[PDB]
Structure formats: C-alpha cells, structure tokens
Design an enzyme around this catalytic site. Sequence first.
Site, PDB file in Angstrom:
ATOM      1  N   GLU A  59       0.586  -1.380   0.041  1.00  0.00           N
ATOM      2  CA  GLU A  59       0.084  -0.067  -0.055  1.00  0.00           C
ATOM      3  C   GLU A  59       0.782   1.306  -0.117  1.00  0.00           C
ATOM      4  OE1 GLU A  59      -0.009  -2.419   2.562  1.00  0.00           O
ATOM      5  OE2 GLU A  59       0.343  -1.188   4.574  1.00  0.00           O
ATOM      6  N   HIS A  98      -8.229  -4.109  -0.780  1.00  0.00           N
ATOM      7  CA  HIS A  98      -7.450  -4.058   0.469  1.00  0.00           C
ATOM      8  C   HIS A  98      -6.494  -3.008   0.293  1.00  0.00           C
ATOM      9  CE1 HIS A  98      -5.559  -6.323   3.832  1.00  0.00           C
ATOM     10  NE2 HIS A  98      -4.479  -5.831   3.178  1.00  0.00           N
ATOM     11  N   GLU A  99      -5.652  -2.934  -0.618  1.00  0.00           N
ATOM     12  CA  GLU A  99      -4.540  -1.837  -0.703  1.00  0.00           C
ATOM     13  C   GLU A  99      -5.302  -0.423  -0.773  1.00  0.00           C
ATOM     14  OE1 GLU A  99      -1.823  -2.961  -0.147  1.00  0.00           O
ATOM     15  OE2 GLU A  99      -1.877  -5.120  -0.708  1.00  0.00           O
ATOM     16  N   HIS A 147      -6.055   0.801   2.717  1.00  0.00           N
ATOM     17  CA  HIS A 147      -4.897   0.942   3.553  1.00  0.00           C
ATOM     18  C   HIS A 147      -4.633   2.577   3.611  1.00  0.00           C
ATOM     19  CE1 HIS A 147      -2.822  -2.275   5.342  1.00  0.00           C
ATOM     20  NE2 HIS A 147      -2.767  -2.938   4.364  1.00  0.00           N
ATOM     21  N   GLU A 177      -3.616  -4.344   9.916  1.00  0.00           N
ATOM     22  CA  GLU A 177      -4.172  -5.567   8.898  1.00  0.00           C
ATOM     23  C   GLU A 177      -5.607  -5.732   9.069  1.00  0.00           C
ATOM     24  OE1 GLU A 177      -2.710  -5.775   6.287  1.00  0.00           O
ATOM     25  OE2 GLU A 177      -0.692  -5.102   6.896  1.00  0.00           O
ATOM     26  N   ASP A 181       9.822 -10.648   9.491  1.00  0.00           N
ATOM     27  CA  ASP A 181       9.503 -11.474   8.417  1.00  0.00           C
ATOM     28  C   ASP A 181       9.288 -12.751   8.696  1.00  0.00           C
ATOM     29  OD1 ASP A 181       9.807  -9.334   6.426  1.00  0.00           O
ATOM     30  OD2 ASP A 181      12.211  -9.764   6.239  1.00  0.00           O
ATOM     31  N   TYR A 234      -4.079 -10.579  10.099  1.00  0.00           N
ATOM     32  CA  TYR A 234      -5.149 -10.168   9.104  1.00  0.00           C
ATOM     33  C   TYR A 234      -6.530 -10.679   9.601  1.00  0.00           C
ATOM     34  CZ  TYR A 234      -1.432  -9.214   5.716  1.00  0.00           C
ATOM     35  OH  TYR A 234      -0.274  -8.536   5.201  1.00  0.00           O
TER      36      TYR A 234
HETATM   37  N1  LIG Z   1       1.202  -4.587   3.807  1.00  0.00           N
HETATM   38  C1  LIG Z   1       1.741  -5.527   3.034  1.00  0.00           C
HETATM   39  C2  LIG Z   1       2.975  -6.144   3.568  1.00  0.00           C
HETATM   40  C3  LIG Z   1       4.334  -6.360   3.149  1.00  0.00           C
HETATM   41  C4  LIG Z   1       5.248  -6.987   4.238  1.00  0.00           C
HETATM   42  C5  LIG Z   1       4.699  -6.795   5.580  1.00  0.00           C
HETATM   43  C6  LIG Z   1       5.307  -7.179   6.878  1.00  0.00           C
HETATM   44  C7  LIG Z   1       4.684  -6.685   7.998  1.00  0.00           C
HETATM   45  C8  LIG Z   1       5.530  -7.322   9.143  1.00  0.00           C
HETATM   46  C9  LIG Z   1       6.659  -8.065   8.875  1.00  0.00           C
HETATM   47  S1  LIG Z   1       6.496  -8.359   6.888  1.00  0.00           S
HETATM   48  S2  LIG Z   1       2.960  -6.145   5.313  1.00  0.00           S
HETATM   49 ZN   LIG Z   2      -2.444  -5.296   4.187  1.00  0.00          ZN
END
Ligand SMILES: NCc1ccc(-c2cccs2)s1
Ligand SMILES: [Zn+2]
EC number: 3.3.2.6
Length: 606
Positions: A268, A292-293, A296, A315, A372, A380
């Site tokens: 987003e 969704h995007e 955001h 989320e 990550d 979510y």
């Molecule tokens: N909003 C899309 C995202 C891409 C990567 C995200 C991450 C959020 C927390 C760790 S990786 S959220």
């Molecule tokens: Zn998202």
Amino acid sequence: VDTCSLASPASVCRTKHLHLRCSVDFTRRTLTGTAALTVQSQEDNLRSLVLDTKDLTIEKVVINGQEVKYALGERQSYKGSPMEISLPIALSKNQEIVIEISFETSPKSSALQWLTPEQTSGKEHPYLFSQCQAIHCRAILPCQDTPSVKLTYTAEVSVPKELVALMSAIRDGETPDPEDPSRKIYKFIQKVPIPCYLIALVVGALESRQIGPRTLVWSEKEQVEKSAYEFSETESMLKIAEDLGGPYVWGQYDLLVLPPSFPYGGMENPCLTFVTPTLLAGDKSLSNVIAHEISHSWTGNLVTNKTWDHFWLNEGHTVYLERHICGRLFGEKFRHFNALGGWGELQNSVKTFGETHPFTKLVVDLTDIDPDVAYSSVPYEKGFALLFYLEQLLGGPEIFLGFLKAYVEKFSYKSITTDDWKDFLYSYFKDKVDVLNQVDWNAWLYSPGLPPIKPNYDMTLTNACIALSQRWITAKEDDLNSFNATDLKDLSSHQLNEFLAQTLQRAPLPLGHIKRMQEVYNFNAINNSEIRFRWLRLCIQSKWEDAIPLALKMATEQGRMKFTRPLFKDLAAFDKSHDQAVRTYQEHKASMHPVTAMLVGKDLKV
Ligand SMILES: NCc1ccc(-c2cccs2)s1
Ligand SMILES: [Zn+2]
Ligand SMILES: [Yb+3]
C-alpha cells in the site's frame, strides 16, 4: 518502545522530513547518494542520536556544511547496525537541524531486488523495485526505522535515461542529469507525513494507461492492456472507501504491476500501490486485493501501528474495510462468504504454527523476532475476526462503520497502540460499555490459538462448497463415476476456490480421487493463481507425481510468498519431489528476492 529498531525513539528526537538525492547504478547494483534528514529534538541538551542502518556504506555525515563524527555499532542480525551521530552543537527541545548522510547501498540490500533484462517482460532492460515493510527501509538509507515516526519526503533520482523512476509520492518532473547525459533525474514530493516503511522506489522500462480520474496503471508494455482491464473497478472501490473512511487525502491512486517475483499480493505505498502480476486472472476475480490496498489509505497509512507488535491494527482493519467494499459491490452474502473463508485461513495458520504458538497471538512481542519470520495470516484474520465479532456485538455493520470512520478521523497522521484503539472503542461506544465488558479481552488480544468466540456467518454461498467437498471426502471408488463437469456449473471461481480450500483441509485424499478430479473438472487448465495454488497443493499432498513439475513450475515462475513458500514446503515433504525441490531452490536462490530466498531457505532447512 520499538524492539525492532535500533534508532533513538520518538521521545528523544523526530525525523520531520527526508530529502533523498540518489543515483541508481545498475552496473554495480547500488544506490548512491545523500539522505538529508530534518530532525527535531524532543529533549533538552541533545548531543547525539542513533539511526538504523543495514548493509550501508557511510561515506560521511555533514551538519552545517562540516563533517561530524559518527560510528557504526556491531551488526545485530536482521536489525542491522546502529549509527550514532555526534551533534556539533547541543540542541534544546524542539530545535531542528538538517543532517546530511552520504551513503551507498549493498547489492545484497534486503530492501531491494535487482533484475537482469532476462528477468523482465521486455528482455531489453534491467529493473529495480523496493519493499520496505516492515524493517527494510534501513537497508536503503539511514533512518529511524520505526513506524512511530512520520515524516514528509522529497526526492531526486538519477537513472539511465531510457528507464522510468517512480516512488510513493506525487511525480514532480524530469530533466536530463547535468552530471551525465546518459541519465535522467526524476523528482518526487510526498506532502503527507508517512512512516518510513511507506517509502518505495521502482526503476524500469515502464509505461502507463489511465483507468480512472485519479488512477494510472503502470507496468512493462506487455502487461499494460491486461492490467488496465483487471483493475478497472479501482475508481468504484475508491468512492466506496471514501464513503466509509472519509476523504482520500493522497491526491492520486496509481497502480504498479510488478514483475512476478514481488513477494506480496500488494504493498500500500502512498500514491502508488504495488501489486503482484498473479492478480491478472483475466476476469477481475482477485480484485479484493485492490480493495485491500485502497483501504490501507486510511487504515495503515493515516492511522499507523506504533510498532510491529500492533501490526493487527494495520491489517485487521484493512481486511474489515476490504470486505465491506466487496460486500457493497457484490452484496452482504458475499461479504459473509469471504469472512467465513478468512476464518478458515485462520484455522490453517493456527494449525500450522501450533495452537499455543506465540505468533498466534493478536498482539505479538517481536523482541528478538525478525518480523519477516513472524509474518502470517494471524494479524489479518484474527484481527478481522475480532472486528466482525464486535460488529455483531455492538449492533451491526452500519453502527460499527460509524466507529470505523470516527476511529480514522480520531487517529489520522498518528501512530497508535492496541490500548489507544481499545480506549477509543470504549469512548465511542460509551453507552455500550456493559456489552464491551462481555468481551474476553485478555484472550482475544493476548492468548494463542483460535479466538474464544466465533462470529456468526451467513452460509448461502458456502453450502455448495461444503457439500461438494463432503461428497469427495466421503466418496469411495464406486462413487468416482458419479462425479462430473456439471458439478461445477453453478459455482463461481470464488466458490471453486473455497471448494478446494475445504478439500485441502482434509488432505491427503486418495490418489485415485485426485486423478478423477482432474478427469472430470480439468483443474490443470485453470490459471487463476489462487485456484491453481490450492489445487497443486492438494495434488502434492495427495502424492500425485504428475503434479511435481506443475508445482515446481508455479513455485519458481512467480515469487509471491503466499504461493511460493507453501509450494516449496509441500514439495519438500513429498519424498518423490524432495531432492528436486531442494535442488531447484539452490539453483534459483541467487536470482530470487532476498527476503523470499531467506525464508524459503528456512522453510526447507537449507
Ligand atoms: N502491507 C503489505 C506487507 C508487506 C510486508 C509486510 C510485513 C509486516 C510485518 C513483517 S513483513 S505487510
Ligand atoms: Zn494489508
Ligand atoms: Yb459403495
């Protein structure tokens, strides 16, 4: 405080603005230049501050046109190295200074993917894209790499002249580069204060087509026409999101369609949403990802999680608005259909991790956890489940949408915690505190596993998925004949996908049953990436060897981690495909996205 950042916290000092002046050097795979940070002190007698960095080479640091002393601390794993700057003059509270850092990125920057020409659509030019969320911005430029700080930004980016630069910002002009006529400078302004994880850059052979009053779609020329069609509902979605969340404050809403190795469905980035080309199904059926995007632009980009411990705020609310836009476009029963699907995805996550695993908590403690590694469907879907539950508790979608508008209003341009959210929930619903006190807060927010209570779901659209799936699971050999193409004749692509999701939850099925599905339903022929993903998984988990090349092909031909990671895992767990799976990864590893590479490596134990 932000246990994912090594920088001075917002209570010490605050970045107000970044001016980035840089060159993209495709030959060395480096970004070179200056990050000029406008920093306001939050303390009396301030004499030093600390910034995040990760695999950066610092040339020098300049304050008031003079070099000042700095030092880089030891690397702390995925958090990077802290950079301490000695200020030439003690600052008082609220004083501002400009700090200009000359730096260079490493080719292994976990923020970037460098693509050779053969990795692109056109085969003529290389390509660069960034992905800063959660904590990768520090791998592009020194900064307070925490969403608790919001800054505006301006940028000037020099690139080979035949290429196009775009950023998460309003496009502000181009000119030939006075220091190199083989080059162009593209300019950018972002007037709305943002967390630095929202900084994004793309460089490539890009083209655009207009699809709405405030939307251009961007991609290589080969994807433009298809993209213009896939995302044509975009303006409509914005108007619904504006109605639900309030005015869209960002000017334009453009779409960038990335090469297939983009690791997420969407990102987003303000003004310029990044999306996977795996959305290009040809029928708009994956457009919920656009909803969704778009969403955001309120939840996440105006109201921002203070730290990644509160990622669910970003989320869960965004999934909630997303589902509302689709419900408006296609009806309340469809909203319930996708809501109940999302619950299923949550059962999967909780079952994958283990019902007591720390990552199944709504609020997580990321102390010594790489975000990550922690990333999943939980924030979510558990996030959404809480909000759907509360919606049904507090008197319906119309009432709860009033709270959503008021919540965005109340926390625009701010970074908030779960407690800030809950305090405002109680304040807004002050005549419903008796009802809110019925909520098991400790469990919803702080316990692992599935939520203490399941919301109520309309079943209309789901029944036929469950029924068909139950027919296959309970079928014996002398029942396989009774299956037929006409079984699918009244199911939309969303229902086929849910059917497969239903069936995947009881996988493996007998090999004979799966072979028969291919015979009667020809699922091999569907290129809808969500359907194909779940079908290939079901084939590999049910030990169908024919599916091994098809799964290896999908896993590597695109790199959406949602698809690539579970595909590689399935292939590894299947004994017939194990060695090939590991081999394939080792071969592709160097040309993959650096984050995708790292995580697939961990998944495969290599
Ligand atoms: N909003 C899309 C995202 C891409 C990567 C995200 C991450 C959020 C927390 C760790 S990786 S959220
Ligand atoms: Zn998202
Ligand atoms: Yb039978």
